[PDB]
Design a protein around this ligand. Structure first.
Ligand SMILES: Fc1ccccc1Nc1ncnc2[nH]ncc12
Length: 252
């Protein structure tokens, strides 16, 4: 059980806006004062909003992995708060844009690898994420990223677009797009394309182009993620191993 007394929490500065409300950084004093992220919920006075907001916490207590944001606890009395581990450097997408001439290829491949370990862990728990995108990834330090979110047509597998089918294979399709976003320094996929035109493009065998400076072996791995037939896509355990070798060939 994750119920925390509010007096053990000290609110700090706002670090961004979440789905249900402002996200703040703060301190959690337990019997060694830890820096935390505090998710708030402005409309949580109503049980329908509260149940949806707290479902994120219910989902997060199931996981314990170094590349998945940790649930510290919850404050169920109004105003309702979710206490999470703080990832100081913020959202990946913005971090990539800002540090576009700072981060080398080896660092970019490292983030993809780290995300593949988090996704292999989830796949081992038979958990389907449904929203793998660079915007749902958090940066803890310059060499440590975390998966942090528990209609994106341009990230979705064709079967998800056409039939609302979400499986472990559709999650592999989205990871391919996430890797592309990483190597493109946080540029959104299919820029200047309308959401309704994406399915038609994919159906014609069209894919996101090879990013400049992307190793061709890494791009062939992304194209394997983008097999139209879901049964032809690799699983995260294979991706993780591949990304390990690609990373070593880059570090040397
Ligand atoms: F909601 C946000 C919007 C922008 C950037 C970050 C966040 N959110 C966060 N920042 C740092 N650590 C975190 N743990 N859980 C969430 C979160």
């Amino acid at each position: 059980d994750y119920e925390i007394q509010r007096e053990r929490i000290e609110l700090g500065r706002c670090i961004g806006e979440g789905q249900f409300g402002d996200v703040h950084q703060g301190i959690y004093m337990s019997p060694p004062a830890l820096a935390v992220a505090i998710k708030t919920c402005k409309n949580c006075t109503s049980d329908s909003v509260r149940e949806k907001f707290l479902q994120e916490a219910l989902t997060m207590r199931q996981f314990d992995h170094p590349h998945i944001v940790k649930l510290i606890g919850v404050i169920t009395e109004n105003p309702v708060w979710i206490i999470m581990e703080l990832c100081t450097l913020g959202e990946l997408r913005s971090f990539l844009q800002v540090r576009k001439y700072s981060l080398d290829l080896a660092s970019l491949i490292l983030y993809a690898y780290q995300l593949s370990t988090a996704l292999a862990y989830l796949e081992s728990k038979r958990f389907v994420h449904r929203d793998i995108a660079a915007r749902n990834v958090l940066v803890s330090s310059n060499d440590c990223v975390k998966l942090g979110d528990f209609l994106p047509i341009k990230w979705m597998a064709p079967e998800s677009i056409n039939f609302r089918r979400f499986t472990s294979a559709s999650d592999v399709w989205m990871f391919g797009v996430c890797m592309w976003e990483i190597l493109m320094h946080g540029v959104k996929p299919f820029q200047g394309v309308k959401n309704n035109d994406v399915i038609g493009r994919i159906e014609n065998g069209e894919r996101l182009p090879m990013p400049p400076n992307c190793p061709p072996t890494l791009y062939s791995l992304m194209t394997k993620c983008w097999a139209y037939d879901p049964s032809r896509r690799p699983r995260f355990t294979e991706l993780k191993a591949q990304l390990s070798t690609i990373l070593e060939e880059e570090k040397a």
